[PDB]
RNA sequence: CCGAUAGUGAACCAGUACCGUGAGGGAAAGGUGAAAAGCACCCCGGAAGGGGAGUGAAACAGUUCCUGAAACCGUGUGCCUACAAGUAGUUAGAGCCCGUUAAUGGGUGAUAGCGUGCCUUUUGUAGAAUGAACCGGCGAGUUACGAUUUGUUGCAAGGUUAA
RNA sequence: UACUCGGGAGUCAGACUGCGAGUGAUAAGAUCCGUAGUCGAAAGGGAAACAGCCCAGACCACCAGUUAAGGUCCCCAAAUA
RNA sequence: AGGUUCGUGGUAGGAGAGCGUUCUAAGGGCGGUGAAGUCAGACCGGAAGGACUGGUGGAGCGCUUAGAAGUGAGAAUGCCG
C-alpha cells in the first residue's frame, strides 16, 4: 500500500541557498547514516534538516508501519517562501534593502 | 422592420479612421504628420493668413 | 464604456513565445527577446529557400564530374556532348545514375562521345 | 525496369508500384493517368530518348488531391517599419504507378 | 525528396603511396588535397569524411622553381612582443622536408572542424621507406 | 457610467499612517465556506510546522482562505556536450528516443553551407551615437460649436423651422 | 499618355560616381553650380570584407532549365582548354 | 459569371478592404451531465485571427444583423508592483 512517508517544514527562517548546501549531502543515503552526516557538519541548517528527517521517519513507522532499519532518503529539496523586506541606513541619507528570506524543506523516506 | 435585420443604405455610412495604431495601417508612428516640424507638434501650424 | 485590456495581450504574446521553442537561454522564455528571434528566423528561412536550390545543384555537378572523369571525360566536355546529341536529362537524374546504377551512366556517356566525334 | 518521366516542369525517376507526389493534375480519385513524356528506360537493356523515347508510356492512378503543410512567408526590413506576413499551402497530386511500357 | 547521402563508415577508404620526386611543391599538394577530401568519388557528401589515406615518400626531392629556394619565407609568431621568426624554403627542404609538405597541404584544406580531420589522414616521409606496410597501400600515379 | 492600478485622495477605523518648525504634501490595504460545522483524538518537536483521523460537495477551500498567468527558484529524467573561435539561428543531415487534431509526424541533434540584435535619428548606424535589467497592469488625434468638400436619403423653384 | 476643376498630403540637412566649369595648390571622402546614373526608398550576383562602383529590379512554392557581370589548380561550382 | 492583354521592391504620404476588444436592441441559443478564466497539443484561413479535445475552475457566456467607443503597446533616462 503506502511505500513512503514525507514531512515538510513551512516557513523556516533560513535562506534557501544556505540550506540547499547541506541537503545535497544526504540525498540517496540511508537514514541511519544520513542522521550522522547532519550531526558532524558544522552548519546552521543541520539542526533544522535533522529535525525534519527524524519526523519523516517517525510517521513512516507509526502511520504506515515500515522498518526503521530499511529506509533510505530518495527526495529532498528546499523551496522558497515569503521573504521579509527590511532596510539598512547607509551613508549620506540613503537606505539599502535587506531581504530576510525563508524556506520550505521536504524530506521523503522509503524502503529499498 | 425586423430590428434583427437592419441594413442601412449603401454608401451612406463609412468608418472612422484612427491614426497611431501600428505600422500595418499606414498611419502608425508619426500619424500622417511627417518629421520634426512646427506642423508636427501638438497644436501647431500658423494662423489662417 | 470602458474597455480594459485583458486575455488579448497575453494570448498574442504567448503565441510568439511558443514559436521560439528550443532556443538557447532566454530566447525561449522572454517575449521581447523571443520576438526578435522569431522575426529573424523567418528572414533566414525565406532566403534559404533560394539558397537550397543553388546548394543542391552544386552537389549534383560535383558528382557528375567525379563519375565522368572515370571515362576519360570532364563535366564541361560531357554536358556539351549530351546537348549536341539531344538528350535532355537534368542534373538531378544524371547524378542519380552515377551513384546507384553506374552501368547506365556509361551508356549515356558513350553516346556523348559519339556526338563529340561526329 | 525503371523510367524517367517529366511532369510538372521537372523530372522524376519512377518504378512500377512506387507511390509518388507530383504537381496538381486533372482527375478525380481513381482515374488512370497516362504519362507520354518518358526520357529513359533501363533494366537489362537501355533505351535513351532523343529527347523522348518514341511510343513508351507510364500508367498510374491518382489516390489523393490535397495540399501540403502550411508555410508562413515573412519579410521585414530593419529600421524602416516594414513587415509582411503570408501563409502558403501548395496543392499536390498523389499517384501509384501501375505499369511501365 | 530523394538524393543520396553517404554515412560514416559506408564508403571504403583506401591507402595510396605517392612518390614526390621532381614534382613542383604546389602541383603535388593540389592533387593530394582533393584525394583526402573525397572529390574523386560519386559518393561525395559535403558534410561527411569520405576520402582516402595518402602516404608521401621522397619528400626531400620536391621541386621549387625559380628563386623560391631562397626568396620564399615561412613566418611564425609566438604572440610575445617582437617574436617573429622566419625560415627559408630551401633550408626547410634540406632539414625538415616533412614540415614543408604538411604546411603546404594544410592551407589547401577547408578551415573547419572536418578539415582538421582530413589532415590527420596524411603521412609524409622525407626518405624512401614508410612504416605503414601493414595497411597494404597502392601506388597512385599523379595526373 | 466605473468595477478594486478603474470609480472620490478615501469600497477596508482616510485627510488616517508617514514627511515638514510651520503653511502644507499625502498613501498602501476588498473575496474561506451555503452553514464555523474554524481540524475531539494518536505520532515527531521546546515551539513553529508537519503525517494520519474527522467535518465539508471540495482541506491542492485550514483565519491574504474564489480563480492563481509571467518573470524568478528547485527536484527527476529522453537526446547532446571536456581540440573547441560561436548576434546563438536557418538550410542539408547521420545516429538515438517516441507515437499525433494521422500527415510527404514529434524531441535532441555529431558534422557541413549562409549569417554583424530591436527602436530612434540620419547623406550614411552591427555601430565605439540614443533608449530599454526581466515580467505584468496602466499610458498618447477626442468632444462641443462653426466653415468647406465628397457619399446617401426626402422634397424640388423651392427647401426648412429656432425658441 | 497629356490638360482643366476639386479633396488629402509629405518635402525644402542630401550623398557618391562619370563628364563640363568656378574657389583651392589643375590638393581633399573639400566647397559651389550644370548634366546622367545609383543610394536615399533596393533585396539578389561580382569587387576578400565594403549605402553610391559593374550585372540586374524580389507576388508565393519547386531536390527543374538557359544566361549577365565575374570566372574554371585547392579552399570554392566550372578548362591543370 | 467567364475570358484576353499588361502588371504585383518600397521610406514620408494618399486610397480601399478587413480582424479583434467592451457595451446596447432584436432574433435564435448553451450551461452544475459543468460558463468565463487558466494550462497543453502534431487542427483551420492570404494576415490580423478562429475552432476542437483533455486537465484545473465552480457560475455565467457565445452566434447572427445593426449601433456606440475610455479600441489593440516593445521602447517616452515612461508610473506602480
Ligand atoms: Mg539626500
Ligand atoms: Mg545623517
Ligand atoms: Mg478603414
Ligand atoms: Mg507609409
Ligand atoms: Mg512604433
Ligand atoms: Mg520623431
Ligand atoms: Mg514637416
Ligand atoms: Mg465594464
Ligand atoms: Mg495594456
Ligand atoms: Mg535547439
Ligand atoms: Mg483606488
Ligand atoms: Mg482582482
Ligand atoms: Mg509632527
Ligand atoms: Mg464570505
Ligand atoms: Mg494536522
Ligand atoms: Mg512535545
Ligand atoms: Mg499542531
Ligand atoms: Mg487528511
Ligand atoms: Mg467525506
Ligand atoms: Mg472543487
Ligand atoms: Mg465539488
Ligand atoms: Mg463561490
Ligand atoms: Mg489561492
Ligand atoms: Mg508558472
Ligand atoms: Mg571531441
Ligand atoms: Mg490525439
Ligand atoms: Mg551551424
Ligand atoms: Mg552626422
Ligand atoms: Mg538624444
Ligand atoms: Mg541605459
Ligand atoms: Mg513594461
Ligand atoms: Mg491636387
Ligand atoms: Mg529655399
Ligand atoms: Mg538646402
Ligand atoms: Mg546639391
Ligand atoms: Mg573630389
Ligand atoms: Mg562632399
Ligand atoms: Mg558639406
Ligand atoms: Mg530608382
Ligand atoms: Mg530619409
Ligand atoms: Mg544592392
Ligand atoms: Mg550586393
Ligand atoms: Mg577592395
Ligand atoms: Mg559577398
Ligand atoms: Mg541600412
Ligand atoms: Mg517586381
Ligand atoms: Mg549553361
Ligand atoms: Mg571544383
Ligand atoms: Mg507594393
Ligand atoms: Mg488614409
Ligand atoms: Mg441572449
Ligand atoms: Mg466578459
Ligand atoms: Mg476549459
Ligand atoms: Mg469571433
Ligand atoms: Mg469573445
Ligand atoms: Mg487605450
Ligand atoms: Mg521598479
PDB file of C-alpha atoms in Angstrom, chain D residues 10-53:
ATOM      1  CA  UNK D  10      10.567  18.718 -63.556  1.00  0.00           C
ATOM      2  CA  UNK D  11      11.628  15.102 -63.942  1.00  0.00           C
ATOM      3  CA  UNK D  12      11.202  12.142 -61.599  1.00  0.00           C
ATOM      4  CA  UNK D  13      12.677   8.635 -61.707  1.00  0.00           C
ATOM      5  CA  UNK D  14       9.838   6.164 -61.431  1.00  0.00           C
ATOM      6  CA  UNK D  15       9.349   2.457 -60.742  1.00  0.00           C
ATOM      7  CA  UNK D  16       6.412   0.071 -61.030  1.00  0.00           C
ATOM      8  CA  UNK D  17       4.482   0.014 -57.763  1.00  0.00           C
ATOM      9  CA  UNK D  18       6.176   3.162 -56.453  1.00  0.00           C
ATOM     10  CA  UNK D  19       3.961   5.862 -54.935  1.00  0.00           C
ATOM     11  CA  UNK D  20       4.928   9.443 -55.763  1.00  0.00           C
ATOM     12  CA  UNK D  21       3.852  13.054 -55.264  1.00  0.00           C
ATOM     13  CA  UNK D  22       3.642  15.434 -58.230  1.00  0.00           C
ATOM     14  CA  UNK D  23       2.088  18.802 -59.008  1.00  0.00           C
ATOM     15  CA  UNK D  24      -1.663  19.216 -59.310  1.00  0.00           C
ATOM     16  CA  UNK D  25      -3.136  17.250 -62.213  1.00  0.00           C
ATOM     17  CA  UNK D  26      -6.626  16.772 -63.635  1.00  0.00           C
ATOM     18  CA  UNK D  27      -8.853  13.947 -62.461  1.00  0.00           C
ATOM     19  CA  UNK D  28     -10.949  12.732 -59.554  1.00  0.00           C
ATOM     20  CA  UNK D  29      -9.742   9.934 -57.291  1.00  0.00           C
ATOM     21  CA  UNK D  30      -9.425   6.627 -59.124  1.00  0.00           C
ATOM     22  CA  UNK D  31      -8.758   7.959 -62.625  1.00  0.00           C
ATOM     23  CA  UNK D  32      -5.973   6.406 -64.687  1.00  0.00           C
ATOM     24  CA  UNK D  33      -3.397   8.985 -65.791  1.00  0.00           C
ATOM     25  CA  UNK D  34      -1.038   8.239 -68.681  1.00  0.00           C
ATOM     26  CA  UNK D  35       2.383   9.881 -68.991  1.00  0.00           C
ATOM     27  CA  UNK D  36       3.680  10.196 -72.550  1.00  0.00           C
ATOM     28  CA  UNK D  37       6.905  12.156 -71.911  1.00  0.00           C
ATOM     29  CA  UNK D  38       9.448   9.476 -70.989  1.00  0.00           C
ATOM     30  CA  UNK D  39      13.174  10.143 -71.317  1.00  0.00           C
ATOM     31  CA  UNK D  40      14.959   6.895 -70.428  1.00  0.00           C
ATOM     32  CA  UNK D  41      14.060   3.238 -69.857  1.00  0.00           C
ATOM     33  CA  UNK D  42      16.509   0.882 -68.163  1.00  0.00           C
ATOM     34  CA  UNK D  43      16.806  -2.628 -66.812  1.00  0.00           C
ATOM     35  CA  UNK D  44      18.658  -5.454 -68.591  1.00  0.00           C
ATOM     36  CA  UNK D  45      18.854  -3.013 -71.526  1.00  0.00           C
ATOM     37  CA  UNK D  46      18.757   0.725 -72.176  1.00  0.00           C
ATOM     38  CA  UNK D  47      16.511   2.995 -74.238  1.00  0.00           C
ATOM     39  CA  UNK D  48      17.680   6.611 -74.383  1.00  0.00           C
ATOM     40  CA  UNK D  49      15.364   9.141 -75.971  1.00  0.00           C
ATOM     41  CA  UNK D  50      16.477  11.935 -78.276  1.00  0.00           C
ATOM     42  CA  UNK D  51      14.870  13.633 -76.496  1.00  0.00           C
ATOM     43  CA  UNK D  52      11.828  11.411 -75.882  1.00  0.00           C
ATOM     44  CA  UNK D  53      11.544   7.647 -76.186  1.00  0.00           C
TER      45      UNK D  53
END
